[PDB]
Design a protein around this ligand. Structure first.
Ligand SMILES: [Cl-]
Ligand SMILES: [Cl-]
Lengths: 301, 305
């Protein structure tokens, strides 16, 4: 029993992290087979970042402009190319620790584990949700670009995030491993901002189920509601609309608890309106929205 | 920027996790060099757990009564011994993935990463603090006994916790890797219960310093406090006493931020009195006490915002 935010074990990813240096810029790369993946802004100087022409900046670079360090071992770069906002450096040595892996783009609302790294060296692990506004609430300092996010399914690492930048509110933005940004962000030092954060309704509901399953039952009531009335409340509180697909995904937990989703929604309605009346749910004084239904089922049944 | 409960990268510990079976009971063990460490209650039936005599249960066991599996490789046990509440199984193979490591016993307030495991297979990693009542607030299903807690400051893995039991309130108890329980708990199905818990004051202060480092000052005030007056107030909120050792330990964060320790204590006294008036601190609506001063320095910029 118990309920905690928990990351996937990071060992399979630790063994892929390397240090990539281009000129004066050093950040992290991901070494899979004989290719190292990293943010393309590694090729940029400060003045470049102000308005980069990445095509031209890359054309004027050669293999010899890149230094890749796997621990103490230097990896010789023998090719380079760009895919979207990711730089691909072909190296002379296949990573003998390459896990079984896929590149997958994740959907907003879903979670993944971040291995925060500095200078090619793993420093910590934590779980993040891809938020509706396509940012993540990470913990990153300078030198962390190229840190990756991932999920593990059996033996297969699904890489879904590479870290590129910090936004003014302190939240974080990046790309998938094919170099496509999550959200309307660009890899240039220009005015950029997180849009309005909206709350992930299905995850809040999931977490209330987790609370019930862990003996926190005080928010429950005899009442139920409809999708339409609830969604009018959700809109007022900058919650995402709840869909029938969401209701269906929560089905296991409705059954497990005997609390139907729209019954739980009446609970959530009061909490949004009347508040939490001084209590806590699962040790929080806020409504938590970064636990998916899956995340919750893994620990509550 | 940002501030998160951040675990250590778990790989060095993942390579040490094995599956230990005795009888019908399976749980996790820790394979370091040629020894596997696991809870001695693996030799107990459920009937044995009310009043087991571990000496008498163990003398009846042969090496071949212990099945140790590392992935799909069966390890051969060639000896055994009990050290307090931990069973040490000598195996015929030294673990080639053994990291540099040490065993440490921690004090209440200290944090560590837990690699939750089942049937020898790692499932997740998360941070825990040793609570003042010698329990941890973990997430463990049945089969998770033998999961370990650790830190990896610098180059070696410091193992500080092995999981043994769940208490009635849903919190967790275990031992150091020399098999000595934290707290008064025993590997026996007794009516035993966690003591009343209290808030780790020095960690709350460290976290308030983290909030200042990350650019937030709204909770400061114009007041100061003596250490004694601070403790007289804090104890009324079930906060642990703050000691001169704690004040000394917070010196580096005080120097980085320019906020005297006892001035930050005055801020905490006011936060306890007022609440947050709808604000959050580092994303939380309550005062967080599972980040140590060392945790904050580990994670935060060395330059205050
Ligand atoms: Cl909270
Ligand atoms: Cl300690």
């Amino acid at each position: 029993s118990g309920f905690r935010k928990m990351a996937f074990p990071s060992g399979k990813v630790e063994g892929c992290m390397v240090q990539v240096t281009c000129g004066t810029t050093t950040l992290n790369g991901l070494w899979l087979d004989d290719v190292v993946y990293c943010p393309r802004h590694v090729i940029c100087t400060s003045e470049d970042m102000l308005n980069p022409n990445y095509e031209d900046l890359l054309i004027r670079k050669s293999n010899h402009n890149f230094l890749v360090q796997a621990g103490n071992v230097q990896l010789r770069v023998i090719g380079h190319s760009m895919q979207n906002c990711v730089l691909k450096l072909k190296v002379d040595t296949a990573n003998p620790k390459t896990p079984k892996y896929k590149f997958v783009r994740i959907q907003p609302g879903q979670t993944f584990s971040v291995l925060a790294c500095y200078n090619g060296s793993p420093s910590g692990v934590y779980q993040c949700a891809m938020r509706p506004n396509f940012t993540i609430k990470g913990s990153f300092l300078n030198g962390s670009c190229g840190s990756v996010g991932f999920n593990i399914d059996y033996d297969c690492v699904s890489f879904c995030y590479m870290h590129h930048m910090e936004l003014p509110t302190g939240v974080h933005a990046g790309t998938d491993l094919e170099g496509n940004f999550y959200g309307p962000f660009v890899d240039r030092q220009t005015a950029q901002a997180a849009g309005t954060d909206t709350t992930i309704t299905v995850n809040v509901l999931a977490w209330l189920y987790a609370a019930v399953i862990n003996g926190d039952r005080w928010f429950l009531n005899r009442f139920t509601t409809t999708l339409n009335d609830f969604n009018l409340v959700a809109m007022k509180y900058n919650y995402e609309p709840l869909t029938q697909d969401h209701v269906d995904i929560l089905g296991p937990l409705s059954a497990q608890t005997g609390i139907a989703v729209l019954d739980m929604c009446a609970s959530l309605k009061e909490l949004l309106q009347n508040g939490m009346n001084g209590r806590t749910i699962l040790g929080s004084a806020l409504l938590e929205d970064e636990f998916t239904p899956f995340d919750v089922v893994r620990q509550c049944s």
